[PDB]
Amino acid sequence: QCTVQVRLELGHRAQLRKKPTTEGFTHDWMVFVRGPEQCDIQHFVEKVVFWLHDSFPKPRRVCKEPPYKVEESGYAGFIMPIEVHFKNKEEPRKVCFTYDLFLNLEGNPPVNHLRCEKLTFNNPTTEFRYKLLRAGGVMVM
């Protein structure tokens, strides 16, 4: 009997692209998954998959190690599935977030957003519990 809690931060940045009028992409953006400072989520994260809009080349973007990030240019926001796969041998094996990748329209300042997610692992295996604690996970009883 125990629960281990770990924290993820999903986020994105967006700003106007400074390029020729005849390049269609208006924005640079960057989406990520990280841990809090002094935490190392690589201990329990196998990989992160960012599912870009179907219009992008190779829209299924995989980061098997940090940084878990995609940097791109684009002309519109979209809803981005983000799967965080665990180094877990049992359920759950991953978690899927639906990430709102919005751009700064109408000459608004750059976007810099953070979404903080708490994961609660109930009764993890010995092995996976150690990975979570190595990453800076916290136990409860």
Ligand SMILES: O=C(Nc1ccc2nc(CN3CCCCC3)[nH]c2c1)c1ccc(I)cc1
């Ligand atoms: O920006 C979009 N599409 C898009 C489509 C193709 C793109 N290629 C680049 C540029 N890249 C290519 C790969 C290497 C890095 C630069 N950037 C792209 C952006 C988009 C289309 C519809 C909707 I609703 C929402 C977003």
